[PDB]
Amino acid sequence: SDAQEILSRLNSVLEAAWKTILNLASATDAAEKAYKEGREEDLATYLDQAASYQSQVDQYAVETVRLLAELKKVFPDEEADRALQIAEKLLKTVQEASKTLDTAVAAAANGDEETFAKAFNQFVSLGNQADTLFTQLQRTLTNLNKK
Amino acid sequence: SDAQEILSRLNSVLEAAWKTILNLASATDAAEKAYKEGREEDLATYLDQAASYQSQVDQYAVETVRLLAELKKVFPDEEADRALQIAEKLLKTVQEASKTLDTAVAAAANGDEETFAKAFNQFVSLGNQADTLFTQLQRTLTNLNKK
Amino acid sequence: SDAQEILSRLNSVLEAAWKTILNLASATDAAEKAYKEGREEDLATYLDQAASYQSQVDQYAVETVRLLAELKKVFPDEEADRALQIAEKLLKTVQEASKTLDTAVAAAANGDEETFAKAFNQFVSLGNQADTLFTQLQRTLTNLNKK
Ligand SMILES: CNCc1ccc(-c2[nH]c3cc(F)cc4c3c2CCNC4=O)cc1
Ligand SMILES: CNCc1ccc(-c2[nH]c3cc(F)cc4c3c2CCNC4=O)cc1
Ligand SMILES: CNCc1ccc(-c2[nH]c3cc(F)cc4c3c2CCNC4=O)cc1
């Protein structure tokens, strides 16, 4: 069915997105270590890498919203509505994280530790929020694969 | 000179390799954290990322040996021999690290934690050794460049 | 998760891996020809291609073990354990091939033809051994999929 096809694309997207989120977390941790150690060139590299993974998470989140809306058209279902709303909240959250990371990139580039530290802590806080939403989304998708 | 073009290609390779090494170090450190925390599936992902970066380091190390072999051929004397020997020792060390990572990856996949941990700790030690050789190579090449 | 998803991912992994193996064999054969004809720059290109494909085979072999390890946790029978054991031996063999290719690539870059030729012939012999295990693994999975 088209519903099975869409669900199969969604499972692949979310599997890929979780790997990318792991990469984003590792790059964020490495940036934090460089920052603590006063290694500004390492820090700049790790922020660029984090931003690369962040841009990829953002695109997976876009794809997930699109696919869940497509699912709702062919296979209306309480769970699909619920998933789409979580996915839309995640998309907003990851975009906010992207903006905050950009602020951290610019602050490091400008050598403004105070602006950097505030942005970087906000980035991590958004990551905790996004992680919760991603967990909620994953559970909703599991409940969708059992329908 | 063709020599100073070779030296230029070398500096570009080593710059690219250092970026990959920073990525490999972050992946290795994330793998260690996942291992400490008992996050088996996350550990697998970080080990796969490390393996991908490791293959890129190996390729750069091969290219560096090749470029220094080419530099030695344009020299009437043995000016480039020391750099070549250092680069060959770096390549040997990164390939040892790659073999050791293979052992660790297989052990983690096979659920053999004692073997995994021995190999993982050896991998980190080889990383410290390779880092020492890499910085030595960079200094030796700066000496071959006119400024 | 889910044995039917696991078996389907496994089939996809082995289909992809077989294509990569075919490409590895073509690169290996081109490297042998370049060696015999004395074209060392061609040999370098083919060895680099082989190294790339080998790293991909290694990754697919790891994935295969991990999938079959999952299958054995979900359906713990002798037939699952048998399939996993073949896949673990395949992974061991491909990682030995990888270590041997590393030796050959370093020898070719270091201009040590005697070591290169010995390691290259060992590489091919390990490839024929891995091919036997790969085909055995396919036959085992046919019993597991049951059409
Ligand atoms: C100690 N680790 C700090 C940390 C904690 C969380 C994250 C994280 N998790 C996410 C999940 C998710 F679905 C999306 C994002 C993230 C992050 C960094 C923020 N950005 C995300 O896109 C990054 C770093
Ligand atoms: C606390 N961080 C532990 C750690 C320390 C070092 C490395 C490292 N550094 C390298 C430099 C280098 F030139 C080559 C390699 C490495 C590593 C991991 C091993 N492999 C390398 O290729 C990885 C992890
Ligand atoms: C004349 N052809 C020589 C040749 C024969 C076999 C291979 C080969 N086959 C494999 C199967 C397999 F499952 C894994 C590997 C290989 C190879 C090169 C070794 N490496 C493999 O990973 C490469 C070259």
Side-chain angles (χ1 to χ4, degrees):
Chain A
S1 60
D2 218 38
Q4 277 291 284
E5 220 170 326
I6 293 163
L7 270 168
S8 161
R9 297 185 64 220
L10 273 157
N11 295 316
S12 290
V13 165
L14 290 202
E15 186 184 326
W18 181 245
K19 290 179 185 217
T20 299
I21 288 163
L22 285 172
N23 290 334
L24 179 52
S26 60
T28 298
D29 292 354
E32 172 80 313
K33 173 182 149 73
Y35 179 49
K36 287 184 187 176
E37 288 172 2
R39 284 185 64 61
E40 298 325 296
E41 286 302 319
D42 291 9
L43 176 56
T45 294
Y46 287 128
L47 295 169
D48 281 356
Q49 192 54 69
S52 179
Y53 293 132
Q54 180 68 76
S55 270
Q56 289 175 258
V57 177
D58 295 344
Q59 180 61 16
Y60 288 131
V62 160
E63 292 166 4
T64 296
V65 165
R66 184 277 204 264
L67 287 165
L68 284 163
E70 202 188 339
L71 186 61
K72 282 178 58 175
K73 257 181 187 173
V74 317
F75 180 62
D77 171 13
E78 208 65 83
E79 218 53 40
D81 303 351
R82 172 160 172 52
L84 172 64
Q85 291 323 288
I86 292 154
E88 289 176 354
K89 183 63 163 123
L90 178 65
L91 177 57
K92 290 198 148 265
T93 301
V94 303
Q95 190 65 51
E96 196 31 62
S98 299
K99 180 188 191 181
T100 304
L101 184 61
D102 281 353
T103 302
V105 167
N110 293 335
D112 175 356
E113 217 179 73
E114 292 203 317
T115 299
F116 171 81
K118 172 187 192 189
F120 191 86
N121 285 336
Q122 285 171 356
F123 181 75
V124 168
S125 284
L126 288 162
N128 292 325
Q129 286 169 234
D131 177 82
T132 297
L133 289 162
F134 193 81
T135 291
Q136 298 172 324
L137 185 55
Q138 281 177 308
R139 184 197 325 149
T140 303
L141 187 54
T142 297
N143 285 347
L144 207 45
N145 297 295
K146 269 160 212 162
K147 277 180 143 200
Chain B
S1 297
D2 203 40
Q4 298 285 322
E5 279 150 53
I6 295 163
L7 270 310
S8 184
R9 284 153 83 210
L10 280 154
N11 291 330
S12 266
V13 171
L14 296 168
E15 142 181 77
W18 180 246
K19 197 165 200 123
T20 301
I21 285 158
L22 288 172
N23 290 328
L24 179 54
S26 55
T28 300
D29 289 0
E32 188 169 38
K33 175 180 190 161
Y35 180 46
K36 290 167 187 207
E37 296 174 353
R39 292 184 283 112
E40 301 303 274
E41 299 174 342
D42 294 350
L43 172 59
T45 297
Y46 288 127
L47 291 172
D48 286 358
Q49 200 48 69
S52 175
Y53 291 130
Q54 182 67 71
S55 274
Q56 299 185 309
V57 177
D58 295 341
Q59 174 63 38
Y60 287 133
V62 171
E63 289 173 20
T64 296
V65 172
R66 284 194 200 131
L67 287 162
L68 278 163
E70 191 189 345
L71 187 69
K72 182 182 179 185
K73 287 184 194 161
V74 318
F75 283 175
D77 48 39
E78 337 282 336
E79 195 77 26
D81 293 27
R82 179 161 173 271
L84 178 60
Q85 311 319 338
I86 291 162
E88 291 177 343
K89 180 159 188 213
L90 175 64
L91 175 60
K92 183 169 166 164
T93 304
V94 305
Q95 289 183 330
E96 278 163 2
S98 188
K99 169 191 79 175
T100 303
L101 185 62
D102 278 345
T103 300
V105 170
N110 285 333
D112 178 358
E113 157 155 0
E114 280 269 335
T115 300
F116 166 77
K118 184 185 185 203
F120 190 83
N121 295 318
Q122 292 170 349
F123 179 74
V124 168
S125 182
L126 284 163
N128 297 142
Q129 293 164 224
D131 177 79
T132 298
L133 288 161
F134 190 90
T135 65
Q136 177 172 40
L137 185 58
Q138 293 171 303
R139 288 191 300 270
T140 300
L141 294 182
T142 292
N143 280 8
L144 289 173
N145 283 274
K146 283 187 171 158
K147 245 174 271 187
Chain C
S1 186
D2 184 74
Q4 288 312 117
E5 274 221 287
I6 291 165
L7 293 166
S8 160
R9 284 178 82 210
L10 255 171
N11 283 337
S12 295
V13 165
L14 298 173
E15 169 173 44
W18 187 249
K19 295 182 173 63
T20 299
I21 285 159
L22 282 171
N23 297 127
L24 178 54
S26 66
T28 299
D29 291 356
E32 178 77 319
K33 177 173 138 64
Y35 169 70
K36 275 182 181 223
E37 305 184 349
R39 288 193 303 285
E40 286 191 353
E41 296 180 354
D42 292 3
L43 176 57
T45 293
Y46 291 126
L47 288 177
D48 287 356
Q49 203 48 62
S52 196
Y53 290 135
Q54 181 69 67
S55 277
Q56 302 182 292
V57 174
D58 289 1
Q59 171 68 36
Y60 287 133
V62 178
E63 286 169 31
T64 295
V65 167
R66 286 180 191 149
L67 287 158
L68 287 162
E70 292 175 31
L71 185 70
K72 181 190 167 190
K73 299 185 189 174
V74 316
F75 288 112
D77 62 343
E78 281 277 31
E79 182 56 25
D81 191 63
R82 152 163 191 74
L84 176 60
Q85 291 318 125
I86 296 158
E88 294 172 348
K89 183 166 136 203
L90 177 62
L91 173 61
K92 190 167 154 233
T93 304
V94 308
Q95 292 183 329
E96 193 179 353
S98 198
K99 171 183 83 163
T100 302
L101 183 62
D102 273 353
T103 298
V105 168
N110 279 55
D112 175 3
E113 178 186 282
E114 154 182 57
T115 296
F116 166 78
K118 168 160 117 133
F120 184 93
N121 296 327
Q122 293 165 358
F123 180 69
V124 171
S125 168
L126 287 162
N128 288 131
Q129 291 191 297
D131 177 292
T132 299
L133 291 161
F134 193 102
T135 299
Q136 188 190 18
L137 184 59
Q138 302 179 106
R139 290 194 297 273
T140 294
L141 294 180
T142 301
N143 279 335
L144 277 175
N145 282 278
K146 285 179 170 69
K147 288 137 165 279

